[PDB]
From a paper:
We also solved the crystal structures of these menin mutants, showing no structural changes in the MLL1 binding site on menin. We found that point mutations in menin do not change the protein structure and only minimally perturb menin residues surrounding the MBM1 binding site. In contrast to the predictions from computational studies, the crystal structures of the menin mutants revealed that these point mutations have no impact on menin structure or stability. Furthermore, T349 is even more distant from Pro13, and the T349M mutation changes the conformation of M327, which adopts multiple conformations and approaches MBM1 as a result of the bulkier side chain of M349. On the contrary, biochemical studies showed that M327I and T349M mutations in menin have a relatively minor impact on the affinity of MLL1 binding. Our structural analysis clearly shows that all these point mutations exhibit a steric clash with the menin inhibitor Revumenib, overlapping with inhibitor fragments that extend beyond the Pro13 binding pocket on menin.
Author numbering: 2 to 53, 74 to 386, 399 to 461, 549 to 588
The structure:
Amino acid sequence: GLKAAQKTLFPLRSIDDVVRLFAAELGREEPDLVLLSLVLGFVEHFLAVNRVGLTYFPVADLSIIAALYARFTAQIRGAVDLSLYPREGGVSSRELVKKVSDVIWNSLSRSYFKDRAHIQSLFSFITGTKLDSSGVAFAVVGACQALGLRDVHLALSEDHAWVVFGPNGEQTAEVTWHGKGNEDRRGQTVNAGVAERSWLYLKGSYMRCDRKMEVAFMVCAINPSIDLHTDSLELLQLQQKLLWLLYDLGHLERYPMALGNLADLEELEPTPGRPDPLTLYHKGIASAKTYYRDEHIYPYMYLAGYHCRNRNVREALQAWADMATVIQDYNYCREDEEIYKEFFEVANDVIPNLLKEAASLLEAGSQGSALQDPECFAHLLRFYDGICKWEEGSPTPVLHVGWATFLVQSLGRFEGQVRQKVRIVSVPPVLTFQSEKMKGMKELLVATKINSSAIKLQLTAQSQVQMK
């Protein structure tokens, strides 16, 4: 049950009242994940899903929130008999974690769109019997906290969620699905995925949350979207204030994606007296380097996106090259398609559009153009090099001829005299290639008119030209 001290701030009449509740719960040894998710889901429902009747803020009455809370705890306590799963050493068993996962899973509506907005919270679970993938993982952790299972915690990659538990928190269990059309692995470890060096499991350099980081997860999970063209200003402000609360308390230190989210929010609407977006993006990169062996892609993606939006071509190219330098040490595996799509879109859409505008501006007499900067040409080359090296050793290939036309066009946006300045140096501006594909392509990179046909042959598996 909710404790008297958890009840005293209600009713919550404003954004700032919600923030005060989060501050009060974060001052406890176990912030109450169920309470906090239900509150966020309630206000997100009445600020983004149905704004009918809204005049300022959807007041959250204790009676309403307590009844939702009681529905959740009744449904978990009645379905999970702890006596069947004795806790050896004050830690949980795999069978207990599987049972909790089953209880959440089996509660969900039989058929619904899993990609929908606003199905992340326990409010969605109780009122609509709908959750998205990571929403199930979070709900399992919240259920385990409600049961007294202090060792069960959320684990997060850049594209998936599961749990850690057990002796020293060293066990892993799948508790939800990943993507669409993949085979369920609920109950199993993540060790096969770690051992195959897929992006999905980050080579083991994934987040292992404490309770405070689980609060940060639900705050990052707030979705201000009303429709394709409209966000709730109220929810953006709430999320931003909550992220700064977490930041000040130290709970974003090990959470690169939260730092990126906060930077994005500051770019939209800066908070006076706070660090700039750029500072925050760089903090997210530093966090990844410090705590995650520099094995995360999104810290660089977030930075590159900022530079791209600000048409800072040099800076954007540098950050995408840095992205590619991370991915090069992975193997491209069967459930890694989201990061393939990101690299494909950068190479084959975003970079081409950026360089097309840069070429028009150069024609109009721009100075200091990325297209006249050999260091920028080197960043483009390093981006392709890391993608080629990623492909090496991978069970599934990355490149194909549909990449080749965009490579030739992008290369060609730099005049030959600029391209000539980069010295490509071998182990055993200056650039070293890691990939064999780019090493073989070196020869082709300085001609006044690039040999398109030869580039295509070198980038792809094709080794012959047409017969006739």
